[PDB]
Design a protein around this ligand. Sequence first.
Ligand SMILES: O=P([O-])([O-])O[C@@H]1[C@H](O[C@H]2O[C@H](CO)[C@@H](O)[C@H](O)[C@@H]2O)[C@H](O)[C@@H](O)[C@H](O)[C@H]1O[C@H]1O[C@H](CO)[C@@H](O)[C@H](O)[C@@H]1O
Ligand SMILES: O=P([O-])([O-])O[C@H]1[C@H](O)[C@@H](O)[C@H](O)[C@@H](O)[C@H]1O[C@H]1O[C@H](CO)[C@@H](O)[C@H](O)[C@@H]1O
Ligand SMILES: [Ca+2]
Ligand SMILES: [Ca+2]
Lengths: 133, 132
Amino acid sequence: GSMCPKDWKLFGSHCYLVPTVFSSASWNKSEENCSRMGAHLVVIHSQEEQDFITGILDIHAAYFIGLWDTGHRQWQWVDQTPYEESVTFWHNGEPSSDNEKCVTVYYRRNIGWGWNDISCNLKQKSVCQMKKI
Amino acid sequence: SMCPKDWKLFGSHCYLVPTVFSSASWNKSEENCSRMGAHLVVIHSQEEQDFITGILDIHAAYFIGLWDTGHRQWQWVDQTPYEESVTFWHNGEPSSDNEKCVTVYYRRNIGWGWNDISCNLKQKSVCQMKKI
Ligand SMILES: O=P([O-])([O-])O[C@@H]1[C@H](O[C@H]2O[C@H](CO)[C@@H](O)[C@H](O)[C@@H]2O)[C@H](O)[C@@H](O)[C@H](O)[C@H]1O[C@H]1O[C@H](CO)[C@@H](O)[C@H](O)[C@@H]1O
Ligand SMILES: O=P([O-])([O-])O[C@H]1[C@H](O)[C@@H](O)[C@H](O)[C@@H](O)[C@H]1O[C@H]1O[C@H](CO)[C@@H](O)[C@H](O)[C@@H]1O
Ligand SMILES: [Ca+2]
Ligand SMILES: [Ca+2]
C-alpha cells in the first residue's frame, strides 16, 4: 500500500506532517506530539530536505525543528544523527544567543527560509518526520 | 531471486556498494541506502565483516552504519545492540572524540578494520537489507 500514513507527505526515505490542529506549543511539547505519531521533529541533513520541508510550510509561521543545544552551541538532532555545521541553514546573524537552546525555521521577506535559535519555552508550530514503509 | 538485481546475498541479507551515487557524507550515504529500502551495513559477526569486506575495493574506505551519539556511545542505524566484544576496530581505533562516524578500510599487510572519522568526509558506502 502507501509508504506514508494518510495525509503525510513523501520525500526521500521519509514522511512529513505539519500538525495543523495541535495549537502552538513549546519545543518539548512539540517533540512529544511528534512522538505520539511515531515521529520526531524534523532532522534536516541536506539542502533537498530544507527545501522540501520549507515548501510545505506557511511563510507567515515559524516552526520548531528537531535541533537543540546540549551545551554551548553543541547542536544535536533529536534522532542523535550527526550534526554537520557545513550543511546548515542558519539565517544571517544566527545563532544569536547561548540562552536560546532550541531552533525554529521561518521565512525572512526578500531572503527566504532559515534557522533561528530561540527559547525552548516559546510556543511555535512544528513539523514532524518518520521513516516510510 | 532472494535479492534485488545487482545486490549480493549473504545469510538473511542483501548487500550493495552503491555506484550511481558517488562518494558522500555519512548522513547522505545513510539516506541513499534508506531510499532503496536499505541502511548502511550493520556488522554483527566475523562472517558478516568478512563477506562485506570481500565485495569491496582494498583502495577505498566505506562508511558502515555505526556512529557515536554522544561520548564513545556507539549505535547501529537499525537500533540493534552494540557489542564491544564483537567489533573489528583497527589498532589504535576508535582514535578521537571528534570522529563520530565509522568507515571500514584496508591496511596494507594487516587487512580490513574499522576507523572512526569525521562524519562530514565523503566516502564510499555499503547498504544492507533483508532478503525476500
Ligand atoms: O523581537 P522579540 O521580542 O521576539 O525578540 C527579541 C529580538 O530577538 C528575536 O529576533 C532575533 C532576530 O533579529 C532572533 O535572533 C532572536 O532569537 C529572537 O527571535 C531581539 O533581537 C533580541 O535582542 C531580544 O533578546 C529578543 O527578546 C526575546 O527573546 C528573549 C530570550 O529568549 C526573551 O527573554 C524575550 O522576552 C523575548 O521573547
Ligand atoms: O590528513 P590525514 O592523514 O588523512 O588524517 C590525519 C588526521 O587529520 C589527523 O587528525 C591525525 O592525527 C592523523 O593521524 C591522520 O589521521 C588519519 O589516520 C588515523 C590512523 O592512522 C585515523 O585514526 C584517523 O581517523 C584518520 O583517518
Ligand atoms: Ca536567535
Ligand atoms: Ca580514527
